[PDB]
Amino acid sequence: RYHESVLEIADIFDQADFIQTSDAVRQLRALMPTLSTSQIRHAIERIAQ
Amino acid sequence: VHMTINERAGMSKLVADNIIASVIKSNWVVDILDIEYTAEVMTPSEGYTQHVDAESIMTAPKGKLFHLQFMDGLLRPEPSAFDPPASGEDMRLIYPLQP
Amino acid sequence: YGAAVVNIDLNRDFFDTATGIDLTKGIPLVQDLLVPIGVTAGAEQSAEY
Amino acid sequence: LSDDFKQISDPKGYLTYSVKYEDQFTKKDKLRASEADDRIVGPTVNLFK
Amino acid sequence: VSGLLMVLFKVMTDNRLVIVGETTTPMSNTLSTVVNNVLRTTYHNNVGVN
């Protein structure tokens, strides 16, 4: 009977200075395949490229 | 039968063809959730540039992006009153699951 | 007059191939970021999106 | 101080499966799946064809 | 009998010490879930049979 859902940190924190992002990026990481550390290094090296 | 296929992998070519024939001969509705695709929306006057066998849809690799095309037949003018009647029937198989 | 459809796409002129981004299929697609290691990536991977 | 260890990379077992097929039902043709799932599952489905 | 002996000898003298070989790490989305539940990040290219 639970409803799983994302909750922005901003909706529970009044200190706006320490809240840089939102639900969007987690929603983005949901698309992302589980990443090996080697694959992460490959992403970083490629973006750098 | 509204058959849903979550994982095409492992499926025999025989069972795939048989399910397709079941869709035709027995009016099965086969949702296949495992395809990722990128629709292009064609105008009626540019036709369907790309043709696709059911066989390719059934044996597409799991990670590859398919590229389906779809008509918007809204801009298709009425037939002339004296165009000969069409005894045959235009058919269709593939459809989107979501808008 | 006679415009069959007016879609809103990512501006390909902005998101150039300088940024590694094809947009021709209607979505951004980058060639070598999230990739299997030890094997060639393959064509038209959905991960590219 | 000692050459204690030979250093193989992808080690062979002391045992293996070995298979006799009945040619009358065997299809000579190699089994194939999606390229990745064949890179793993593949040698196996050929042995227990 | 002697065959068994040599088998044992070749076992007693198996001083092999495995070093990680060629090892592919597939993007997960390409694998059917039945393989994903089995796969643990990265297999050796010489998969073997099971």
Side-chain angles (χ1 to χ4, degrees):
Chain A
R1 208 175 179 225
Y2 63 86
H3 178 230
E4 178 172 20
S5 82
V6 202
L7 168 69
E8 291 185 6
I9 276 301
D11 303 329
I12 75 180
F13 251 103
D14 302 331
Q15 304 284 352
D17 300 30
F18 309 108
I19 314 168
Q20 327 300 330
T21 54
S22 53
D23 173 36
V25 47
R26 144 134 27 216
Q27 170 189 334
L28 165 58
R29 195 198 44 185
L31 299 174
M32 223 149 295
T34 309
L35 284 192
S36 163
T37 61
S38 184
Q39 301 186 281
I40 292 164
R41 136 168 277 92
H42 202 310
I44 292 170
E45 286 180 0
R46 172 75 157 115
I47 289 181
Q49 181 182 131
Chain B
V1 162
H2 179 202
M3 175 155 306
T4 299
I5 304 180
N6 302 281
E7 213 188 353
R8 287 179 331 267
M11 192 164 58
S12 173
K13 181 160 176 285
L14 284 194
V15 177
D17 183 89
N18 175 255
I19 287 171
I20 272 304
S22 298
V23 148
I24 284 173
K25 292 296 194 58
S26 295
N27 304 103
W28 279 15
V29 185
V30 168
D31 289 42
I32 307 177
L33 321 181
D34 33 68
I35 297 271
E36 282 75 12
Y37 61 94
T38 50
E40 206 172 352
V41 183
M42 320 271 74
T43 81
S45 54
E46 81 185 331
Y48 281 120
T49 92
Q50 159 247 27
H51 298 74
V52 279
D53 309 31
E55 196 62 32
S56 67
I57 223 72
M58 279 308 215
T59 61
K62 206 247 182 50
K64 216 196 77 289
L65 262 170
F66 222 100
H67 183 100
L68 296 183
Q69 285 177 356
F70 299 102
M71 193 51 68
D72 171 25
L74 225 286
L75 232 55
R76 183 181 308 182
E78 289 183 358
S80 73
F82 312 105
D83 269 275
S87 62
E89 194 69 22
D90 298 319
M91 285 293 181
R92 195 176 160 190
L93 257 73
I94 337 187
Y95 298 86
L97 244 17
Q98 72 212 207
Chain C
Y1 200 99
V5 266
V6 183
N7 280 35
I8 301 184
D9 306 33
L10 287 317
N11 185 332
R12 78 162 51 99
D13 299 27
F14 183 82
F15 300 117
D16 206 319
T17 50
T19 339
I21 305 173
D22 69 79
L23 269 144
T24 53
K25 277 198 149 200
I27 44 163
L29 290 184
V30 175
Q31 288 309 285
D32 221 272
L33 223 85
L34 310 185
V35 54
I37 62 168
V39 270
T40 38
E44 310 176 358
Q45 268 280 336
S46 69
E48 285 180 359
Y49 161 83
Chain D
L1 302 180
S2 46
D3 200 323
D4 40 315
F5 289 143
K6 188 181 173 187
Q7 307 184 35
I8 44 87
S9 285
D10 307 89
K12 290 160 313 181
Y14 301 155
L15 302 186
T16 37
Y17 297 104
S18 64
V19 182
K20 283 195 170 61
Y21 314 96
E22 206 267 350
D23 306 329
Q24 187 208 355
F25 301 120
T26 286
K27 225 80 168 183
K28 214 69 173 185
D29 49 43
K30 182 167 269 63
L31 293 82
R32 286 297 248 270
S34 67
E35 180 65 28
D37 305 29
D38 172 85
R39 289 185 66 85
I40 301 166
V41 162
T44 302
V45 294
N46 305 345
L47 197 71
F48 314 136
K49 69 170 70 273
Chain E
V1 176
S2 64
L4 295 177
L5 280 184
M6 289 319 286
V7 157
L8 196 39
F9 191 79
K10 196 68 193 318
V11 155
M12 125 186 291
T13 330
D14 195 43
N15 58 340
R16 291 178 305 163
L17 177 63
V18 227
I19 304 178
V20 175
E22 295 295 333
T23 31
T24 152
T25 306
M27 256 98 167
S28 78
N29 50 270
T30 43
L31 311 180
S32 33
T33 76
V34 70
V35 173
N36 244 42
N37 301 343
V38 160
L39 223 285
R40 290 133 104 117
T41 305
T42 162
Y43 57 103
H44 282 78
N45 297 17
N46 181 21
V47 214
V49 185
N50 198 280

